[PDB]
Amino acid sequence: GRRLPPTPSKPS
Amino acid sequence: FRYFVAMFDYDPSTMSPNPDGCDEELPFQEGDTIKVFGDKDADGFYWGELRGRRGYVPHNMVSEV
């Protein structure tokens, strides 16, 4: 259904 | 209601895989605190409010306090 964006590179 | 803190900048116009995300997904910068109501939905999104506006928030972008 609704899609998630990709989890990126690194936290901060 | 729970608070989550944004770990990433998020602009649904340019970053959301959902062509409707611009009207239905919340925009946020890192450090923003989001009022989340209820639980994560099956899609992986929270429901919440930020700066008087409500919309959907991807869980992989925020962390629960």
Numbering used by the authors:
A (entry chain a): 1686 to 1697
B (entry chain A): 1317 to 1381
Publication excerpt:
RBP, via its second and third SH3 domain, is known to bind synaptic ligands such as Ca2+ channels and RIM. Drosophila RBP SH3-II and -III share 49.2% sequence identity and adopt the canonical fold of SH3 domains. We observed the classical poly-proline helix that allows for mainly hydrophobic protein-peptide interaction in all three structures. In summary, we find that the SH3-II and -III interaction surface of RBP serves as a multi-functional platform for differential protein interaction with either other AZ components or the transport adaptor and therefore, motor-cargo linkage.
Finally, in order to get a deeper atomic insight into the structural basis of the binding of RBP towards Aplip1 in comparison to its synaptic ligands, we crystallized the Drosophila RBP SH3-II domain together with both an Aplip1 and a Cac peptide, and RBP SH3-III with a Cac peptide. We detected the same hydrogen pattern between the protein side chains and peptide backbone in the structure of SH3-II with Aplip1 and Cac. The major difference is the side chain orientation of R1687 of Cac that π-stacks with its guanidinium function with Y1372, except for one copy, where it forms a salt-bridge to E1341. A second major difference is induced by the two consecutive proline residues in the Cac peptide. Consequently, the peptide has a more polyproline type II conformation that brings T1692 closer to the protein surface and allows P1693 to deeper point in a hydrophobic pocket of the SH3-II domain. The side chain orientation of Cac R1687 is again different if bound to SH3-II or SH3-III. Completeness of the model given for the six complexes of RBP SH3-II and the bound Cac peptide 1685IGRRLPPTPSKPSTL1699.
